[PDB]
Amino acid sequence: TLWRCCQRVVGWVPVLFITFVVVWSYYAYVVELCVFTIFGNEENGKTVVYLVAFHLFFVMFVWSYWMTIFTSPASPSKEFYLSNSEKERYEKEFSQERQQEILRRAARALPIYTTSASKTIRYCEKCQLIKPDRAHHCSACDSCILKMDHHCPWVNNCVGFSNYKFFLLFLLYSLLYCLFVAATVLEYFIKFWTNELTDTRAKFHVLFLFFVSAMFFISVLSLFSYHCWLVGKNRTTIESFRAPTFSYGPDGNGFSLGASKNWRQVFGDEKKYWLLPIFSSLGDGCSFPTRL
Amino acid sequence: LWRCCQRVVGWVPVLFITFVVVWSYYAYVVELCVFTIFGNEENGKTVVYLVAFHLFFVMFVWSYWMTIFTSPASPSKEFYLSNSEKERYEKEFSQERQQEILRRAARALPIYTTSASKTIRYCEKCQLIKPDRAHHCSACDSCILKMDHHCPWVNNCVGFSNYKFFLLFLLYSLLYCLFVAATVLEYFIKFWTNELTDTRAKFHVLFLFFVSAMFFISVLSLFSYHCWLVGKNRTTIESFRAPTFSYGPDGNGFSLGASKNWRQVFGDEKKYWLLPIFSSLGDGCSFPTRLVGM
Numbered sequence: 401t402l403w404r405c406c407q408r409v410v411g412w413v414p415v416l417f418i419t420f421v422v423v424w425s426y427y428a429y430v431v432e433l434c435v436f437t438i439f440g441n442e443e444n445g446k447t448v449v450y451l452v453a454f455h456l457f458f459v460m461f462v463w464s465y466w467m468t469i470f471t472s473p474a475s476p477s478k479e480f481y482l483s484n485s486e487k488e489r490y491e492k493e494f495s496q497e498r499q500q501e502i503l504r505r506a507a508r509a510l511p512i513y514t515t516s517a518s519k520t521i522r523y524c525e526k527c528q529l530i531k532p533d534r535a536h537h538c539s540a541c542d543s544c545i546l547k548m549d550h551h552c553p554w555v556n557n558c559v560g561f562s563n564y565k566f567f568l569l570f571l572l573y574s575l576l577y578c579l580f581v582a583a584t585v586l587e588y589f590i591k592f593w594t595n596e597l598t599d600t601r602a603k604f605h606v607l608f609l610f611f612v613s614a615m616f617f618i619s620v621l622s623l624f625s626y627h628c629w630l631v632g633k634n635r636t637t638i639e640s641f642r643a644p645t646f647s648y649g650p651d652g653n654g655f656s657l658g659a660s661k662n663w664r665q666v667f668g669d670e671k672k673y674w675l676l677p678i679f680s681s682l683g684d685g686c687s688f689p690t691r692l
Numbered sequence: 693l694w695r696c697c698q699r700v701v702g703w704v705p706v707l708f709i710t711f712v713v714v715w716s717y718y719a720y721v722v723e724l725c726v727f728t729i730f731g732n733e734e735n736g737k738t739v740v741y742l743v744a745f746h747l748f749f750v751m752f753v754w755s756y757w758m759t760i761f762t763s764p765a766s767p768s769k770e771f772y773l774s775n776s777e778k779e780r781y782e783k784e785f786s787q788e789r790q791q792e793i794l795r796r797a798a799r800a801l802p803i804y805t806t807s808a809s810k811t812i813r814y815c816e817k818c819q820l821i822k823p824d825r826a827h828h829c830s831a832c833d834s835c836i837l838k839m840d841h842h843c844p845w846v847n848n849c850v851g852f853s854n855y856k857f858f859l860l861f862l863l864y865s866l867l868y869c870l871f872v873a874a875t876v877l878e879y880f881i882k883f884w885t886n887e888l889t890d891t892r893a894k895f896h897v898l899f900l901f902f903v904s905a906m907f908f909i910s911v912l913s914l915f916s917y918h919c920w921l922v923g924k925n926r927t928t929i930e931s932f933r934a935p936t937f938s939y940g941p942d943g944n945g946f947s948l949g950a951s952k953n954w955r956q957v958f959g960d961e962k963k964y965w966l967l968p969i970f971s972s973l974g975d976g977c978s979f980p981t982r983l984v985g986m
């Protein structure tokens with residue numbers, strides 16, 4: 401009965417965890433490193449430069465992370481749903497041959513160019529809708545996600561057609577945020593181990609700062625290089641495991657329009673919006689251009 | 693009692709400046725950087741201007757906050773007349789023996805100045821012996837150590853505690869306006885010659901340049917004045933009425949040289965010179981003198 405409230409809240413635990421580490425990083429870098437360590441070394445010039453640059457990376461990081469969490473994933477349009485008359489005919493009939501004849505008649509009035517592995521119309525029994533191309537159902541979101549990529553647990557949302565460019569920018573600014581921390585703490589991370597700087601609480605944070613920042617850089621870098629290929633091939637993570645089957649058979653590059661035009665499907669034609677977590681993706685998520 | 697009314701009405705100049713600063717943050721970030729400069733496909737200048745603006749905006753609001761809420765330092769309790777001395781003072785009726793009571797206490801205090809009439813500087817309201825460079829302010833209703841002036845735009849007194857913050861407040865006020873005027877200028881040209889014709893952005897970009905320029909021209913005169921005062925080790929009051937020492941009036945009685953005079957306000961550590969953090973030397977109740985006194 402009340403299991404929904406516990407399940408809904410426990411999904412925010414990875415978000416609150418990442419939020420704490422990021423808040424801890426803002427404290428450790430600004431207070432412990434810049435004020436207690438670099439400012440305690442009479443380096444007013446270096447102190448100010450690091451503080452300004454850090455806030456730029458920190459803002460672009462928190463901005464991208466926020467947009468990746470709270471951008472609700474787009475759902476299929478109302479045209480894809482089975483009408484109350486057509487839904488009855490589907491649940492009333494018992495022959496899977498006539499079941500396909502009902503779905504095919506409605507689907508041919510829809511911009512659908514893909515089928516299932518069994519040459520059947522892609523249909524979702526729970527949502528009672530015909531899945532658009534590249535759209536899949538997520539048992540965590542309990543809904544169909546347009547151009548679904550994967551359900552990332554570290555954010556309480558699904559990475560889909562609406563989230564994708566934000567998720568990419570979140571990864572991008574995550575390495576830049578971590579690389580900038582590691583590259584700047586490094587020259588002082590040398591100090592605390594070899595006993596050049598001996599502050600009590602600053603040692604605990606600066607050491608943890610370098611460890612955590614470097615660990616996240618190596619971990620996320622693997623994921624970032626992974627998606628850079630996916631964007632150029634116009635393949636979601638789901639399609640990278642099962643290639644979509646078109647009318648002419650399975651094709652791993654059925655949605656590819658060339659490397660240049662594929663990046664424009666995610667980031668758009670406006671170059672000024674490429675680095676900003678602002679929605680600039682082309683199309684609507686319910687239909688996609690085909691290679692043929 | 694109108695002391696309660698003065699306390700509330702005293703925040704009007706503070707709330708006014710707060711509006712102009714908040715309005716400036718909106719006009720520059722939203723109207724100028726997002727609607728105007730970013731609408732010109734100049735992503736490089738937009739990011740640079742936004743980052744630089746936030747640097748000036750932070751240092752400006754920090755100095756203004758410290759100038760407002762830094763309570764002015766008052767004379768120590770040793771300067772106050774003791775309850776024994778208060779009665780003998782109130783008992784006596786001859787102003788000649790009254791000075792002999794104040795002169796007896798002042799010689800146990802680091803006092804090297806008198807009034808223009810060579811009498812002990814004494815405050816009837818506070819019932820204390822005024823330290824050097826300390827004056828009474830009827831708006832603060834208290835004696836202010838090294839009092840400079842009562843600025844209404846901060847609703848506070850500029851004294852021994854506030855001075856370096858007040859100076860930094862003036863400093864970062866000019867830079868904030870200079871950065872606004874120098875960057876809005878290239879776009880202030882456009883709206884008049886009808887290159888950019890947005891309705892809302894025109895009101896804000898034009899007002900941004902006017903208000904920023906009109907504040908720069910006013911504060912620069914005030915800022916240049918105090919830069920001379922700091923080099924002369926003179927408060928605004930002392931620059932109008934020279935303090936009277938044991939050897940007579942001296943306009944440079946507190947001067948210790950240009951280099952050591954700035955160090956009295958900003959300190960010896962250069963890292964604290966530009967930051968609104970208290971780095972002034974001394975305690976405000978006694979100051980080094982040009983002569984053998986201190």
Ligand SMILES: Nc1ncnc2c1ncn2[C@@H]1O[C@H](COP(=O)(O)OP(=O)(O)O)[C@@H](OP(=O)(O)O)[C@H]1O
Nearest residue numbers: 814815822826827828829830831842928929932933
């Ligand atoms: N009631 C007051 N409230 C605020 N400022 C005052 C008040 N009375 C005098 N002042 C100012 O503070 C200075 C007062 O000098 P006084 O000796 O008369 O009394 P003081 O102990 O307050 O200094 C004056 O500066 P001036 O040399 O330019 O005239 C005056 O401007």
Ligand SMILES: CCCCCCCCCCCCCCCC(=O)O
Nearest residue numbers: 421422425551552553554574612616
């Ligand atoms: C010291 C603070 C460092 C903060 C570093 C940023 C945290 C990066 C978190 C990466 C989350 C990646 C989400 C992918 C989810 C998934 O596995 O599907």
Ligand SMILES: CCCCCCCCCCCCCCCC(=O)O
Nearest residue numbers: 712716843844845865869903904907
């Ligand atoms: C758009 C530009 C906004 C800038 C606003 C800056 C406001 C500066 C205020 C200066 C106050 C100076 C204090 C004077 C005190 C006095 O002697 O009366």
Ligand SMILES: [Zn+2]
Nearest residue numbers: 524527537544
């Ligand atoms: Zn579904």
Ligand SMILES: [Zn+2]
Nearest residue numbers: 538541551558
């Ligand atoms: Zn999901």
Ligand SMILES: [Zn+2]
Nearest residue numbers: 829832842849
């Ligand atoms: Zn006052």
Ligand SMILES: [Zn+2]
Nearest residue numbers: 815818828835
């Ligand atoms: Zn007084």
